[PDB]
């Protein structure tokens, strides 16, 4: 009483119910470096202009 | 001559005080800028001298043909 599978039946993606837990760290990765602090706040105008030699603005 | 053409000594005095304040603030700002640039060149933790690295949005996380990857 065995039925031969048709075309594309064996190539299906199926689901599996298993008791073993999901590995939370399969790559054995360590702690990522902390990113740089972002930029925040409103843009105030430059204090006393360019401040390049004698230029006032 | 003093009434018609010449500025008052008080006006010149306070104008000089304002000028000195402005250039003193500019000089302290310049020194702080040089120190900040040196520190961010040395450590690289701030917004400047952030040379690009590889973006991590190009990685494919789908299962591959071989399980060992």
Q: How many CA atoms lie within 13 A of A57 on its CB side?
A: 0
Token pair recorded at residue B11: 């006006």
**DSSP tally for chain A: helices H, then strands E:** 0, 0
Of the residues A28, A38, A51, A56, the best mutation for testing chain B's interface (the one with the most B CB atoms within 10 Å of its CB) is A51
| Helix boundaries (H) for B1-69 | 9-43
- Put simply, whether A36 touches B (Cβ < 8 Å) is yes
CB neighbour list of residue B16: distance below 8 Å, 6 or more residues apart: none
Residue B50 to residue A36, Cβ atoms within 8 A:
yes
Record the resolution, in angstroms: 3.2
């Amino acid at each position: 009483g065995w039925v031969r599978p048709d075309l594309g039946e064996l190539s299906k993606v199926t689901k599996v119910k298993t008791d073993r837990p999901l590995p939370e760290n399969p790559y054995h990765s360590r702690a990522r470096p902390e990113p740089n602090p972002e930029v925040e706040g409103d843009l105030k105008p430059a204090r006393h202009g360019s401040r390049l030699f004698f230029w006032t603005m | 001559i003093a009434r018609t053409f010449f500025d008052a000594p008080e006006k010149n005095y306070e104008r000089t005080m304002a000028i000195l304040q402005i250039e003193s603030e500019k000089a302290e700002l310049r020194l702080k800028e040089l120190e900040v640039r040196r520190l961010m060149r040395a450590k690289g933790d701030g917004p400047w001298f952030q040379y690009p690295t590889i973006d991590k949005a190009l990685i494919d996380h789908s299962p591959k043909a071989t399980p060992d990857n």
